């Protein structure tokens, strides 16, 4: 899957609304602030940052990545992104009680309920939910995600990735 190029423009505090995290000697988006330079260019939780301003991110720590952003010179920051490489999609169907079949806490799937659609479809635990029927749920309270599910209809398509 080919990477893509984005050019961000800093806000007033020299920030772009982005938190990053080192995973397996790569750099990944950990949080994207709403209505930020990062959201303007379509960054999402789980996107991989391959390069910043012409430097490869391979092997950088979280602290280094944050420092490079904070210190970035001028008002424009260039990045090359591999769109969330660990993403998978699972489609489930609600049962007669309105459930798809998993336990959820602090943004993580923690258990799979027996005899459910989640079980039939091989949903995994220690995974975060990124989207529900296309809607970002990263950073939402568990109760807000419950709200969303209540109005999603019988078909529930989620994007997930390992929590790492």
């Amino acid at each position: 899957m080919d990477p893509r190029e984005v050019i961000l423009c800093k806000d007033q505090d020299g920030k772009i609304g982005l938190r990053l995290k080192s995973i397996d000697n790569g750099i990944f988006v950990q949080l994207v602030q709403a209505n930020s330079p990062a959201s303007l260019v379509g960054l999402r939780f789980g996107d991989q940052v391959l390069q910043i301003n012409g430097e490869n991110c391979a092997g950088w720590s979280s602290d280094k990545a944050h420092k490079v952003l904070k210190q970035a010179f001028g008002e424009k920051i260039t990045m090359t992104i591999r769109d969330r490489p660990f993403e998978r999609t699972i489609t489930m169907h609600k049962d007669s009680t309105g459930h798809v079949g998993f336990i959820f806490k602090n943004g993580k799937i923690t258990s799979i309920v027996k005899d459910s659609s989640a079980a039939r479809n091989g949903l995994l635990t220690e995974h975060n939910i990124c989207e529900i029927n296309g809607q970002n749920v990263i950073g939402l309270k568990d109760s807000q995600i419950a709200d969303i599910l209540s109005t999603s209809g019988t078909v529930v398509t989620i994007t997930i990735m390992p929590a790492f």
Binding site: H99, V100, G101, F102, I103, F104, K105, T110, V113, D142, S143, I145, A146, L149
Partner: peptide, 5 residues
């Protein structure tokens, strides 16, 4: 404080 979905 676990939710059942």
């Amino acid at each position: 404080n676990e939710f059942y979905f």
